[PDB]
RNA sequence: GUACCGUGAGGGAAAGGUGAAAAGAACCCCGGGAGGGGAGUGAAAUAGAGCCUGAAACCGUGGGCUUACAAGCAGUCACGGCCCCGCAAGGGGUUGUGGCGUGCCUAUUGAAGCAUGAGCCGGCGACUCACGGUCGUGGGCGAGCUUAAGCCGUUGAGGC
RNA sequence: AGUGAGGGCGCGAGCGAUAACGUCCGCGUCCGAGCGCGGGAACAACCGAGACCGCCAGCUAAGGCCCCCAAGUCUGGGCU
RNA sequence: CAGGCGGUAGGGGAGCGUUCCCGAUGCCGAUGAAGGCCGACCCGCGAGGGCGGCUGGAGGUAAGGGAAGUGCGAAUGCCG
């Protein structure tokens, strides 16, 4: 009994261009040309999905940074002041109230600024 | 959650004088308004800057030697067209490139980068050509 | 000479872009006067054979 | 008027009426849970050290379910070595009901 | 049934290398380990035969679907003598039949039936056996298959 | 509303002609039968006839009115093409690839 | 064993399918014809003979997003705009700017590599089988286990 | 089963020129197979560190905290 | 509940899909079989499998087992 190739390959390549739209020239439609880019799709996500996470802890420290320049002091300062606080409100969620509460901010860089001393 | 994003912004323009400050340590600061990383919402995908007005450019100071021996180099395309003139020759001549040069070496190359550097407004010596802009003096 | 010989496959694109001149023009037509018809400037007109008011080819 | 929420693992600013999504639970899908305050704010200005003693928010566990696959590859080169994991998150989607601060 | 010549030459063709034309790569070439013919049989030990003859049957008693019997009343040779013999012992064919007799006469009656397959008692087996629910049979097989057992 | 005749088989290659059909894709059916008539290219003999025939059906067989004409859409595509072969240098043949097109043109009505 | 190739011995292809039935499209329209448009046949004519299904590469036409101070393994992550499906929440398409980013294969101490193979697509394509070894394992019987060729019977029935 | 071309670095020797991204052994490491991740501008083998998956959560490691680039134009004393 | 889970040569394991046989005098099927094209839905870690719309026009084959010409991107592979 000769199982003839058949259904099999052509189906398989197929959810292979599935996954590959939008891919610019041959990369969208060659086989062999999208396993190759998206072998590489595979990759950069799951780099960037481990990179994502420290992408916006930057940019929140640099909303943050630019708060406490408005009250004199600095970020550098600012955090070990509510590290002695006790205070644990994180990054995210600081960044957040420099923007939509700039009081509620302002109080948090009195507390950390009195608990330094 | 999400991050806020900025909505959209009024530029904010600044009046620097540079009279009489180091070249290098200006041009730090000068950056970071262009670049507008000062103000707690900034993004780097968009352009939200300070769009600064510098002052006296060609009254600006520099240390050591530098003067003389701090040499600008740029190269033509033909052969020998390393062109090497002095920064002594260079704010002589063309003041305001000099704090120009500077800062364009310290925002970020590319697009917005770019864009950024256009928003920054050199003159040398005593005033600029848009007080109707009405540029707020800050000290730094 | 050794053969000079194309050294990658030319893109869609760049096939494609090349060809962006390649659009052809279409004629210029004036109306010959004396039929109304339309005819190529400073030839004599095709179908009535008049040109510059006289008539100079019979048709 | 808010609250700094904490729960999986990961800081939330919630109001009353909220719709938002957390780190799955173990509670009922259709009954509730408080949340611990870390800070309490917007008529108020209150900060904890780290939480906020008295302040508590009630939350309605609407519903659990699971997220949304996402294909994980790996790929190392001329090795022939290649991974799919297919992968979708739990979690828990709570109704912020009410603060108690 | 090819030729042997090698197609082209080894070197300097530009084209890759290769022999005839048979050659398994090509098409039209022969078959990389395509099946020629097989004895798929072995000896199944007699032992273990004459041991699954047992269960196989003993199964059948054991959901008490073995029915021994000795009279084949009207049965002769037509369909609808055995048709209604059958009527007359629970084989209304709901379930299907293994029928295992000595005689023709019945087996060719109850040949044309869609439930039922005949045996001579010598060729009784457990493929068979396993494939019916209700195995029904002749004393004089039943003599046979314990004497082909023992 | 409209309609529409299809040249196939024409022994010419595609991408000569749709340079050809290309002048006139949406001028008006007059504009186009003089765009043709002075047109320095083979390909408007095989477009003109295409247009001429096409417009006669619209009139002749959907109701529709000569002056109310224009070329909707058109397209040239690409039909089987005559393999034959080319000795070249050396003993070297080579495959010439005398190609030939489908030519379609639609018209419709408008009413101003 | 044809076309075709070789003086010759000899080599040696490709090429199947309308429909239930030709009912294989009268007649009109443009056209030199080809071919198309109507009409007509059919259950269906993108079943119209270059005929079943009709994938891919490849080539067109229309639509939407997009692009002419940006630089590049073409992706990815984020944001944002315009477009489409959703009352909403949501999604799908696109991609302006920002973060990050050295193709696949093989061979290698080492490759993005200026080492190797691949134009692209489809299809064909490579660890088998017979005997006999040797472990392992699922069973049968166990100081015993087992039959070979054959003979008898069956037409997929076994027994001897 | 595979392996029986190893390579670099540290250290201990020979050979070499107290030459070589050299070579040949001994100990160890790392690469190989960790060309996955952070530093090191970039860069297998130097420093940090052994990637089951997810997170717009947190402490650190090497290295860093003028700006491109996250975080001190921090602090005190001294030299150039 | 605690702990392990980078990995080439390579050892082991568990599965998926193709062709065919028993299951089949059965069952699905013009109220549409195989295949083709879509899909943001469903299930699965994955290979896959369902479902639904379009096409297509006559075949297909369960649970459970069995046997193999069984899965291609590379061979300057072969054919088109
Ligand atoms: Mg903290
Ligand atoms: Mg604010
Ligand atoms: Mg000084
Ligand atoms: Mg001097
Ligand atoms: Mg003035
Ligand atoms: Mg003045
Ligand atoms: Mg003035
Ligand atoms: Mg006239
Ligand atoms: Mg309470
Ligand atoms: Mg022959
Ligand atoms: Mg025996
Ligand atoms: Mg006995
Ligand atoms: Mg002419
Ligand atoms: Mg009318
Ligand atoms: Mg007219
Ligand atoms: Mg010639
Ligand atoms: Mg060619
Ligand atoms: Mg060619
Ligand atoms: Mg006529
Ligand atoms: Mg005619
Ligand atoms: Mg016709
Ligand atoms: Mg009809
Ligand atoms: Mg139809
Ligand atoms: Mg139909
Ligand atoms: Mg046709
Ligand atoms: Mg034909
Ligand atoms: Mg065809
Ligand atoms: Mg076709
Ligand atoms: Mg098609
Ligand atoms: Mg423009
Ligand atoms: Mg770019
Ligand atoms: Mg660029
Ligand atoms: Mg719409
Ligand atoms: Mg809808
Ligand atoms: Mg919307
Ligand atoms: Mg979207
Ligand atoms: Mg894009
Ligand atoms: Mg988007
Ligand atoms: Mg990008
Ligand atoms: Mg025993
Ligand atoms: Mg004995
Ligand atoms: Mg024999
Ligand atoms: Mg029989
Ligand atoms: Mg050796
Ligand atoms: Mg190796
Ligand atoms: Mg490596
Ligand atoms: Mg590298
Ligand atoms: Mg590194
Ligand atoms: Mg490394
Ligand atoms: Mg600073
Ligand atoms: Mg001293
Ligand atoms: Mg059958
Ligand atoms: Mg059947
Ligand atoms: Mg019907
Ligand atoms: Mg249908
Ligand atoms: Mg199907
Ligand atoms: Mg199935
Ligand atoms: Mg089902
Ligand atoms: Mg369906
Ligand atoms: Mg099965
Ligand atoms: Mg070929
Ligand atoms: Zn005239």
Redesign the pocket.
């Known amino acids: 009994?000769?199982?003839?190739?058949?259904?099999?390959?052509?189906?398989?390549?197929?959810?292979i261009?599935?996954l590959a739209?939008?891919?610019?020239?041959?990369?969208?439609?060659?086989?062999?040309?999208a396993?190759?880019?998206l072998?590489?799709?595979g990759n950069?996500?799951?780099?960037?999905?481990?990179?994502?996470?420290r992408?916006?802890?930057?940019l929140?420290?640099?909303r943050i940074?630019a708060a406490c320049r408005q009250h004199g002091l600095?970020?550098?300062?600012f955090?070990h002041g509510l590290?002695k606080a006790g205070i644990?409100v994180?990054?995210?969620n600081?960044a957040d109230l420099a923007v939509r509460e700039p009081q509620v901010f302002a109080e948090l860089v009195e507390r950390a600024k009195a608990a330094q001393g | 959650?999400?991050?806020y994003?900025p909505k959209q912004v009024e530029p904010r323009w600044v009046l620097i004088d540079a009279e009489g400050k180091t070249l290098?340590?200006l041009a730090?600061?000068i950056?970071?308004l262009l670049?507008g990383?000062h103000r707690p919402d900034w993004?780097?995908?968009?352009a939200m800057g300070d769009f600064v007005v510098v002052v006296n450019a060609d009254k600006i100071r520099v240390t050591g030697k530098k003067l003389e021996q701090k040499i600008y180099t740029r190269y033509s395309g033909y052969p020998g067209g390393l062109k090497k003139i002095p920064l002594e020759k260079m704010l002589a001549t063309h003041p305001e490139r000099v704090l120009e040069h500077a800062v364009k070496?310290?925002?970020?190359?590319?697009?917005?980068?770019?864009?950024l550097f256009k928003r920054l407004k050199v003159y040398a010596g005593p005033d600029h050509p848009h007080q109707a802009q009405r540029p707020e003096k800050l000290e730094v | 000479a050794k053969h000079p010989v194309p050294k990658k496959?030319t893109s869609?694109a760049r096939?494609?872009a090349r060809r962006s001149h390649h659009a052809l023009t279409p004629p210029i037509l004036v109306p010959c006067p004396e039929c109304k018809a339309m005819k190529p400037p400073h030839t004599v007109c095709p179908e009535c054979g008049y040109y510059a008011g006289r008539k100079v080819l019979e048709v | 008027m808010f609250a700094i929420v904490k729960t999986?693992?990961?800081?939330y600013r919630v109001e009353p009426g909220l719709?938002l999504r957390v780190?799955k639970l173990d509670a009922e899908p259709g009954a509730t849970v408080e949340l611990p305050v870390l800070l309490l704010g917007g008529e108020k200005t209150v900060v904890g050290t780290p939480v906020v003693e008295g302040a508590s928010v009630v939350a309605e566990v609407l519903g659990h379910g699971?997220?949304?696959?996402?294909?994980?590859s790996?790929?190392?080169?001329?090795?022939?070595?290649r991974?799919?994991?297919?992968?979708r998150?739990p979690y828990t989607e709570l109704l912020i009901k009410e603060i108690r601060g | 049934?090819?030729?042997g010549?090698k197609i082209w030459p080894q070197?300097?063709?530009?084209?890759?290398?290769?022999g005839?034309?048979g050659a398994?790569?090509?098409?039209?070439?022969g078959?990389?380990?395509?099946?020629?013919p097989?004895?798929?049989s072995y000896?199944l030990?007699?032992?273990?035969?004459?041991?699954g003859?047992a269960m196989a049957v003993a199964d059948r008693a054991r959901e008490g679907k073995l029915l021994l019997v000795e009279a084949f009343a009207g049965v002769n040779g037509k369909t609808k003598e055995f048709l209604a013999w059958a009527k007359e012992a629970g084989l209304d064919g709901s379930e299907?039949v293994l029928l295992v007799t000595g005689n023709e006469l019945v087996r060719r009656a109850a040949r044309?039936?869609?439930?039922?397959?005949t045996?001579?008692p010598?060729?009784?087996?457990?493929?068979?056996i396993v494939?019916t629910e209700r195995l029904v049979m002749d004393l004089d097989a039943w003599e046979v298959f314990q004497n082909?057992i023992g | 509303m409209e309609?529409?005749?299809?040249?196939?088989?024409?022994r010419i290659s595609?991408?000569k002609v749709?340079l050809v059909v290309?002048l006139i894709?949406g001028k008006s059916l007059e504009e186009a039968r003089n765009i043709l008539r002075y047109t320095n290219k083979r390909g408007a003999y095989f477009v003109a006839?295409?247009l001429?025939?096409?417009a006669?059906?619209?009139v002749?067989?959907?109701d529709m009115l000569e002056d109310r004409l224009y070329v909707k859409?058109?397209?040239?595509?690409?039909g089987?093409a005559?393999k034959r072969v080319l000795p070249r240098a050396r003993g070297r043949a080579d495959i010439i690839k005398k190609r030939t097109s489908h030519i379609t043109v639609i018209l419709g009505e408008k009413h101003g």
């Open positions: 009994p000769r199982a003839k190739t058949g259904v099999v390959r052509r189906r398989k390549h197929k959810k261009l599935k739209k939008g891919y610019w020239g041959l990369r969208s439609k060659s086989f062999r040309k396993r190759e880019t072998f590489a799709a950069y996500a799951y780099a960037h999905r481990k990179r994502r996470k992408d916006f802890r930057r929140w420290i640099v940074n600095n970020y550098s300062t955090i590290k644990e994180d990054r995210k600081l | 959650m999400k991050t994003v290098g340590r730090t600061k950056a970071t670049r990383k993004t780097p995908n968009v070496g310290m925002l970020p190359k590319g697009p917005l980068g770019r864009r | 496959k869609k096939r494609d | 999986g693992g990961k800081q719709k780190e699971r997220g949304k696959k996402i294909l994980v790996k790929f190392k080169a001329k090795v022939q070595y991974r799919k994991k297919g992968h998150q | 049934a090819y030729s010549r070197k300097h063709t530009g084209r890759a290398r290769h005839d034309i398994p790569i090509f098409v039209g070439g078959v990389v380990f395509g099946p020629k097989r004895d798929y000896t030990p007699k032992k273990v035969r004459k041991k003859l299907s044309n039936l869609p439930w039922v397959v045996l001579a010598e060729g009784l087996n457990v493929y068979d494939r082909r | 309609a529409k005749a299809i040249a196939r088989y024409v595609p991408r749709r290309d894709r006839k295409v001429e025939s096409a006669a059906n619209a002749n067989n959907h859409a058109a397209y040239v595509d690409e089987p005559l």
